[PDB]
């Protein structure tokens, strides 16, 4: 059933698009000390999943923050400074976010190729006999 | 999924540290020692700290 392929590729593109938006929010918040919720932003990472047990779609089961410590900065005159003058910043790593941007885009585009190629197979089956 | 977070810039405060003091030898030149302000009113007539 090549229609099941469209579900797997379609679920893959959804998963890769979630990771790209997560990467976008990490780059936009690599220097954000404050937040709406009173807790410092932590680098986010969507968790992919596979229900292997034929076609196994990839599903996003939630966003999980990185456990690395928040990068402390010595800013004693800052209004949000603690007793020792340290302000805490997100633990976003620039190099690892660029790799995620490259990986998410390439993984997104290769699933379009599979969906397009699988589309041709179904159309060719419609021509069988006739 | 909680994946979209925006960031906007803001001005949380000002650097209230003592500035650079310039010696001019002028009778009408004064500077605040440490922390303080001078009460002035602008053209509108509203008190403000300068």
């Amino acid at each position: 059933s090549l229609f099941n392929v469209f579900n797997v590729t379609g679920s893959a593109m959804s998963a890769e698009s979630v990771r790209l938006n997560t990467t976008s929010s990490n780059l936009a918040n690599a220097d954000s000390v404050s937040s709406s919720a009173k807790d410092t932003y932590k680098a986010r990472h969507a968790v992919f999943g596979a229900e292997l047990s034929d076609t196994v779609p990839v599903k996003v089961m939630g966003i999980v923050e990185s456990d690395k410590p928040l990068s402390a900065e010595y800013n004693p005159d800052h209004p949000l400074a603690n007793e020792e003058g340290y302000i805490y910043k997100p633990n976003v790593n620039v190099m690892e976010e660029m790799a995620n941007m490259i990986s998410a885009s390439r993984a997104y585009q290769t699933n379009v190729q599979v969906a397009d190629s699988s589309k041709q197979m179904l159309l060719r089956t419609l021509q069988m006999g006739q | 999924h909680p994946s979209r977070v925006f960031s906007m810039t803001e001005r949380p405060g000002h650097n209230f540290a003592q500035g650079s003091v310039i010696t001019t030898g002028r009778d009408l030149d004064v500077t605040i020692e440490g922390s303080g302000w001078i009460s002035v009113l602008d053209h509108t007539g509203k008190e403000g700290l300068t």
Binding site: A37, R44, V47, M61, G62, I63, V64 | H1, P2
Partner: peptide
């Protein structure tokens, strides 16, 4: 259920 997942609702 991923242990300790972030939520999508105002704290």
């Amino acid at each position: 259920g991923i242990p300790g997942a972030l939520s999508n609702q105002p704290p």
